Amino acid sequence: YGNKESNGEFGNELPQRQFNNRDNRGPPRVRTGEKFGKREFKEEPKEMTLDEWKAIQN
Amino acid sequence: SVHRIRITLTSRNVRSLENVCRDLINGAKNQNLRVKGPVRMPTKTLRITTRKTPCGEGSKTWDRFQMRIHKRIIDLHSPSEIVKKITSINIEPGVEVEVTIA
Amino acid sequence: MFIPKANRVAIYEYLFKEGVLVAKKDSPIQKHSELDKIPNLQVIKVMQSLNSRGWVKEQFAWRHFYWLLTNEGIEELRRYLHLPPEIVPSTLTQT
Amino acid sequence: INTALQEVLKKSLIADGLVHGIHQACKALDKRQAVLCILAESFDEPNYKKLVTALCNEHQIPLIRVDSHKKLGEWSGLCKIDKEGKPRKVCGCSVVVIKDFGEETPALDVVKDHLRQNS
Amino acid sequence: ANLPISKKRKFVSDGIFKAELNEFLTRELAEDGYSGVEVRVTPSRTEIIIMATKTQQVLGEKGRRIRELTAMVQKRFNFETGRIELYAEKVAARGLCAIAQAESLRYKLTGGLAVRRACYGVLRYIMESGAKGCEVVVSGKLRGQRAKSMKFVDGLMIHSGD
Amino acid sequence: AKKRKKKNYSTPKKIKHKRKKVKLAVLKYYKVDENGKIHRLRRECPGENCGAGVFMAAHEDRHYCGKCNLTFVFSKPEEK
Amino acid sequence: TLWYSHPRKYGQGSRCCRACSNRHGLIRKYGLNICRQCFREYANDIGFKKLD
């Protein structure tokens, strides 16, 4: 069983390929979508209402 | 009535502890209870040892944590008013006060 | 939750009395300090029941559920126990 | 006109008091916990309606009635008020048996008097 | 009484209590620009000083919000009623705090919030309060996928040393 | 209809129910007599926790009112 | 309801972290109960402003 020191991606799945950045969304190192602006420019109570109605008698 | 009373004080911060103890000893000595003043007790270095990393993986740096608690004893011989006045003032920053009957 | 009605009333009375309850998130403690009548997980879920018909605002900080009883909630929990409106919660006063 | 009766249910509602149902209404009736039984009329298997009277005449005697039901259900305490004129799914009672009813003051007193000595 | 817990555990436990009060209140009193707690335990009453710039909010009409706050601490730690009382206090000369300015940034940010107005603005405000130096760090992806950092410094800022 | 790295859906089949609460327009068992006296078919619990018409179950030689949760089987016979 | 049983009060399940309720992370030691990851952040205000 050979298993080998040569790139052996864990995964990882990333050994050399990793600054070539996928997603196609921005891409790494900033820019542009408007950014970090521009240099250019009675009345009582809970407990005793319970006591008052403790008058059950039964 | 003479009651023999031992006040123990435990708290952390160096300079504040000194000034709280100083006032109590001086006021006691001024009003000649004759004290036996400041028993300076060894500061307990409470040591916790941890890895600087949440999630272990970098070249083993350790951040270790210490805390020092300073204990100091003052003995008063007096009753009614003098006991309760001298205990209740010097109070405010971070002092735990224990008064023992004897 | 699916909780006995006696226990349902027990949470609501006690909650409104203090205006405030705090419960450690730990599913079945059994009986959490304070509410003795009721399993704590049932407390948690019924106090959450109370919460999004708010009534109560939850500040969750430490997995520990801090529940404040807001003023619309005093009117309706007052209605639940019925006890006639001019009921003051814990709005009263000791300096 | 039976609004006197309605009052008594609200007073029992707070006292708790106001049941949930039949199995426990009839429970109250038989050994003395019951002072009122408010049955209605209109229902399928009146084999049950036989039984309301079949619980009534004991040492403990509670009988009223009250027609076409859903309004009497609102009277108990099953409404989470939307609009002021109590919208709910108006959950149907048809018996609320009165247990304990701590109070007394006119409405309870007038209804018990009238049932005993019927005009 | 909480009888004879060791004196080293007892202080540190009171230290659990004090550090606990800080974390709970930062999230709770976040709108009130909350700066700090100091807890002084005294016989029969526990005194907790709420250091908050917005003390009026902390009080709440007829001492409503203060009582709500007392009660949260009461049930959690199991203080029997009136054994703990919370008092609102101003933070010394407000602008310096860093924590008050940090809260200011969150409310501005959620309102939206242009950047050179904000970053240099907080930096300017605290420097104006006579502060020796200030650094505001934004590390964050604003609209573009990748996280960017900028440090905005006007100051003599040590960073290092005791 | 989904995915999992590890395991989608073992199924040995037979999905467990739950339960129905019967129906039955009940409490059918009482007799009304011809002028006018009433007798109750099904005896009820004298045990004080019960407001009692709990109406004891008809099992063969076993009767239990289940209001006391399972507790209190009188058929037939008391403990001396 | 039976069958949510079992005597947990011994061995890691269940003593849990008072700030995040993470089970594995536990610094039990001064009855602290904090969690080492939590403890770094939390360390000031609970003294632990390590001098050395």
From TrEMBL, chain A:
Recorded protein name is Vig2, isoform B
Coiled coil, from the record: none
Q: Which gene encodes it?
A: vig2
